[PDB]
Protein backbone atom coordinates (compact mmCIF):
# COMPACT_ATOMS: atom_id res chain seq x y z
CA UNK A 1 0.00 0.00 0.00
CA UNK A 2 1.42 3.36 -1.07
CA UNK A 3 -0.20 4.90 2.02
CA UNK A 4 2.01 2.76 4.30
CA UNK A 5 5.37 3.89 2.91
CA UNK A 6 5.83 7.04 5.00
CA UNK A 7 5.37 4.96 8.11
CA UNK A 8 8.20 2.55 7.25
CA UNK A 9 10.14 5.70 6.42
CA UNK A 10 9.27 7.30 9.75
CA UNK A 11 10.35 4.21 11.67
CA UNK A 12 13.78 4.41 10.06
Amino acid at each position, epitope marked *: *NWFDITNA*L*WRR
Partner: antibody
Amino acid sequence: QVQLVQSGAEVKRPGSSVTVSCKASGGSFSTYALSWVRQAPGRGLEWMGGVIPLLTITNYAPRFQGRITITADRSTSTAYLELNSLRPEDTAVYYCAREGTTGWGWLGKPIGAFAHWGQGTLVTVSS
Amino acid sequence: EIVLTQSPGTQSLSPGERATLSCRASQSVGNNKLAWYQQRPGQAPRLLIYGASSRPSGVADRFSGSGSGTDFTLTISRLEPEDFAVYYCQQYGQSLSTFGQGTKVEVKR
Protein backbone atom coordinates in the same frame (compact mmCIF):
# COMPACT_ATOMS: atom_id res chain seq x y z
CA GLN B 1 0.96 23.63 12.76
CA VAL B 2 0.86 22.83 9.07
CA GLN B 3 -0.52 25.38 6.63
CA LEU B 4 -0.85 24.70 2.91
CA VAL B 5 -1.25 27.66 0.56
CA GLN B 6 -2.27 27.10 -3.05
CA SER B 7 -1.98 29.15 -6.23
CA GLY B 8 -4.94 31.16 -7.56
CA ALA B 9 -7.95 30.35 -9.72
CA GLU B 10 -7.21 29.45 -13.34
CA VAL B 11 -9.17 29.47 -16.60
CA LYS B 12 -7.99 26.92 -19.17
CA ARG B 13 -9.12 26.12 -22.72
CA PRO B 14 -10.06 22.51 -23.46
CA GLY B 15 -6.99 20.53 -24.47
CA SER B 16 -4.58 22.76 -22.56
CA SER B 17 -2.62 21.93 -19.40
CA VAL B 18 -2.77 23.42 -15.90
CA THR B 19 -0.28 23.50 -13.04
CA VAL B 20 -1.34 24.16 -9.45
CA SER B 21 1.17 24.76 -6.67
CA CYS B 22 0.85 24.06 -2.97
CA LYS B 23 3.30 25.70 -0.56
CA ALA B 24 3.72 24.11 2.86
CA SER B 25 4.97 25.69 6.07
CA GLY B 26 5.32 23.84 9.37
CA GLY B 27 6.18 20.23 10.20
CA SER B 28 8.30 18.08 7.88
CA PHE B 29 7.68 18.34 4.13
CA SER B 30 9.72 15.58 2.47
CA THR B 31 8.74 12.69 4.72
CA TYR B 32 4.93 12.99 4.60
CA ALA B 33 2.57 12.00 1.77
CA LEU B 34 1.01 14.92 -0.13
CA SER B 35 -2.12 14.18 -2.22
CA TRP B 36 -4.37 16.11 -4.60
CA VAL B 37 -8.15 15.87 -4.28
CA ARG B 38 -10.66 17.56 -6.52
CA GLN B 39 -14.34 18.38 -6.42
CA ALA B 40 -16.61 19.35 -9.31
CA PRO B 41 -19.38 21.88 -8.50
CA GLY B 42 -22.07 20.11 -6.47
CA ARG B 43 -20.24 16.77 -6.60
CA GLY B 44 -18.18 14.81 -4.08
CA LEU B 45 -14.47 14.44 -3.30
CA GLU B 46 -12.21 12.45 -5.61
CA TRP B 47 -8.63 11.47 -4.76
CA MET B 48 -6.41 11.98 -7.78
CA GLY B 49 -2.96 11.02 -6.57
CA GLY B 50 -0.08 12.08 -4.39
CA VAL B 51 3.66 12.00 -3.92
CA ILE B 52 6.23 11.27 -1.24
CA PRO B 53 8.82 14.09 -1.77
CA LEU B 54 11.87 12.38 -0.27
CA LEU B 55 11.49 9.19 -2.30
CA THR B 56 9.79 10.92 -5.23
CA ILE B 57 7.46 7.91 -5.25
CA THR B 58 4.20 8.97 -6.88
CA ASN B 59 0.81 7.23 -6.85
CA TYR B 60 -1.92 8.22 -9.34
CA ALA B 61 -5.54 7.06 -9.66
CA PRO B 62 -6.06 4.93 -12.81
CA ARG B 63 -8.49 7.33 -14.48
CA PHE B 64 -5.88 10.08 -14.48
CA GLN B 65 -2.87 7.98 -15.47
CA GLY B 66 -0.91 9.47 -18.36
CA ARG B 67 -2.57 12.88 -18.05
CA ILE B 68 -1.39 13.81 -14.57
CA THR B 69 1.99 14.69 -13.05
CA ILE B 70 2.69 15.42 -9.39
CA THR B 71 6.12 16.57 -8.18
CA ALA B 72 7.67 18.20 -5.12
CA ASP B 73 10.31 20.89 -4.66
CA ARG B 74 11.93 20.11 -1.33
CA SER B 75 13.93 23.34 -1.58
CA THR B 76 10.68 25.30 -1.38
CA SER B 77 8.41 22.81 0.41
CA THR B 78 6.21 23.22 -2.66
CA ALA B 79 4.24 20.44 -4.34
CA TYR B 80 2.78 20.62 -7.86
CA LEU B 81 -0.11 19.12 -9.82
CA GLU B 82 0.05 19.22 -13.61
CA LEU B 83 -3.01 17.95 -15.48
CA ASN B 84 -2.81 17.78 -19.27
CA SER B 85 -5.37 17.33 -22.04
CA LEU B 86 -7.92 19.29 -20.00
CA ARG B 87 -11.63 18.67 -20.69
CA PRO B 88 -14.68 20.72 -19.57
CA GLU B 89 -15.44 17.93 -17.09
CA ASP B 90 -12.17 18.74 -15.32
CA THR B 91 -13.71 22.00 -14.06
CA ALA B 92 -13.37 21.78 -10.30
CA VAL B 93 -11.87 23.01 -7.06
CA TYR B 94 -8.51 21.26 -6.60
CA TYR B 95 -7.09 20.71 -3.12
CA CYS B 96 -3.69 19.54 -1.96
CA ALA B 97 -3.71 17.66 1.32
CA ARG B 98 -0.95 16.33 3.51
CA GLU B 99 -1.37 13.30 5.74
CA GLY B 100 -1.48 13.97 9.47
CA THR B 101 0.64 12.70 12.35
CA THR B 102 -0.33 10.79 15.51
CA GLY B 103 -0.95 12.65 18.74
CA TRP B 104 0.10 16.28 19.04
CA GLY B 105 2.86 17.97 17.08
CA TRP B 106 3.42 17.28 13.39
CA LEU B 107 6.44 14.98 13.53
CA GLY B 108 4.95 11.80 14.94
CA LYS B 109 4.00 8.63 13.12
CA PRO B 110 2.14 9.42 9.88
CA ILE B 111 -1.54 8.44 9.70
CA GLY B 112 -2.33 8.32 6.00
CA ALA B 113 -5.58 10.28 6.40
CA PHE B 114 -5.59 13.92 5.29
CA ALA B 115 -5.33 16.22 8.31
CA HIS B 116 -4.01 19.24 6.44
CA TRP B 117 -5.66 20.87 3.43
CA GLY B 118 -5.02 23.89 1.26
CA GLN B 119 -7.68 26.54 0.65
CA GLY B 120 -8.36 24.99 -2.74
CA THR B 121 -7.91 26.26 -6.30
CA LEU B 122 -10.86 26.63 -8.71
CA VAL B 123 -9.87 25.44 -12.18
CA THR B 124 -12.30 26.27 -14.97
CA VAL B 125 -11.88 24.45 -18.28
CA SER B 126 -13.94 26.02 -21.03
CA SER B 127 -13.78 27.61 -24.47
CA GLU C 1 -11.39 -0.51 -6.97
CA ILE C 2 -13.10 -0.18 -3.61
CA VAL C 3 -16.51 1.49 -3.64
CA LEU C 4 -17.78 3.16 -0.49
CA THR C 5 -21.54 3.56 -0.17
CA GLN C 6 -22.83 6.01 2.42
CA SER C 7 -26.53 5.66 3.22
CA PRO C 8 -28.77 7.45 3.61
CA GLY C 9 -27.72 10.46 1.57
CA THR C 10 -29.55 12.84 3.89
CA GLN C 11 -30.21 12.59 7.63
CA SER C 12 -32.71 15.01 9.24
CA LEU C 13 -31.95 15.80 12.87
CA SER C 14 -31.62 18.66 15.35
CA PRO C 15 -29.08 20.12 17.79
CA GLY C 16 -28.78 17.84 20.82
CA GLU C 17 -29.61 14.64 18.96
CA ARG C 18 -27.39 11.64 18.23
CA ALA C 19 -26.33 10.95 14.65
CA THR C 20 -25.15 7.70 13.08
CA LEU C 21 -23.64 7.64 9.58
CA SER C 22 -22.71 4.44 7.77
CA CYS C 23 -20.17 3.64 5.06
CA ARG C 24 -20.15 0.24 3.33
CA ALA C 25 -17.18 -0.92 1.26
CA SER C 26 -17.64 -3.19 -1.79
CA GLN C 27 -14.79 -5.25 -0.35
CA SER C 28 -12.91 -5.43 2.94
CA VAL C 29 -10.77 -2.41 3.80
CA GLY C 30 -7.14 -3.21 4.55
CA ASN C 31 -6.01 -2.57 8.11
CA ASN C 32 -9.22 -0.68 8.77
CA LYS C 33 -7.81 2.35 6.98
CA LEU C 34 -11.01 4.35 6.77
CA ALA C 35 -11.25 8.06 7.46
CA TRP C 36 -14.14 10.49 7.97
CA TYR C 37 -14.27 14.11 6.86
CA GLN C 38 -16.66 16.95 7.55
CA GLN C 39 -17.17 19.57 4.89
CA ARG C 40 -19.11 22.81 5.07
CA PRO C 41 -20.17 24.64 1.87
CA GLY C 42 -17.33 26.36 0.05
CA GLN C 43 -14.89 25.15 2.68
CA ALA C 44 -12.07 22.62 2.64
CA PRO C 45 -12.78 19.21 4.21
CA ARG C 46 -11.74 18.63 7.84
CA LEU C 47 -10.48 15.28 9.15
CA LEU C 48 -12.54 13.79 11.99
CA ILE C 49 -11.54 10.16 12.31
CA TYR C 50 -8.76 8.00 10.89
CA GLY C 51 -7.94 4.33 11.22
CA ALA C 52 -11.70 3.85 11.52
CA SER C 53 -11.76 4.76 15.22
CA SER C 54 -8.90 7.14 15.96
CA ARG C 55 -9.64 10.81 16.58
CA PRO C 56 -6.91 13.42 16.13
CA SER C 57 -6.24 16.11 18.70
CA GLY C 58 -8.35 19.16 18.01
CA VAL C 59 -11.45 17.20 17.02
CA ALA C 60 -14.38 17.53 19.45
CA ASP C 61 -14.78 14.45 21.62
CA ARG C 62 -18.41 14.15 20.50
CA PHE C 63 -17.14 12.61 17.28
CA SER C 64 -16.54 8.86 17.34
CA GLY C 65 -15.88 6.16 14.78
CA SER C 66 -16.26 2.39 14.92
CA GLY C 67 -16.40 -0.65 12.69
CA SER C 68 -14.05 -2.80 10.66
CA GLY C 69 -14.02 -4.92 7.53
CA THR C 70 -16.68 -3.61 5.16
CA ASP C 71 -19.02 -1.74 7.48
CA PHE C 72 -18.04 1.44 9.27
CA THR C 73 -19.90 4.04 11.32
CA LEU C 74 -19.42 7.64 12.38
CA THR C 75 -21.22 8.65 15.57
CA ILE C 76 -21.84 12.09 17.04
CA SER C 77 -23.16 11.67 20.59
CA ARG C 78 -24.96 15.01 20.47
CA LEU C 79 -25.21 17.45 17.56
CA GLU C 80 -24.16 21.10 17.83
CA PRO C 81 -25.32 23.77 15.32
CA GLU C 82 -22.09 23.72 13.31
CA ASP C 83 -22.24 19.95 12.94
CA PHE C 84 -24.87 20.16 10.22
CA ALA C 85 -22.87 19.60 7.10
CA VAL C 86 -21.74 16.91 4.69
CA TYR C 87 -19.73 13.97 5.93
CA TYR C 88 -17.48 11.89 3.68
CA CYS C 89 -15.77 8.55 4.32
CA GLN C 90 -12.50 7.54 2.68
CA GLN C 91 -10.55 4.32 2.44
CA TYR C 92 -6.80 4.33 1.99
CA GLY C 93 -6.34 0.60 2.51
CA GLN C 94 -5.09 0.35 -1.07
CA SER C 95 -2.98 2.63 -3.24
CA LEU C 96 -6.13 3.61 -5.09
CA SER C 97 -7.81 5.74 -2.43
CA THR C 98 -11.54 6.42 -2.82
CA PHE C 99 -14.26 8.59 -1.19
CA GLY C 100 -17.89 7.84 -0.41
CA GLN C 101 -20.44 10.11 -2.11
CA GLY C 102 -21.15 11.87 1.15
CA THR C 103 -24.04 12.08 3.58
CA LYS C 104 -25.77 15.35 4.32
CA VAL C 105 -26.80 16.05 7.89
CA GLU C 106 -29.48 18.74 7.83
CA VAL C 107 -31.76 20.21 10.49
CA LYS C 108 -35.28 18.76 10.65
CA ARG C 109 -37.92 21.40 11.38
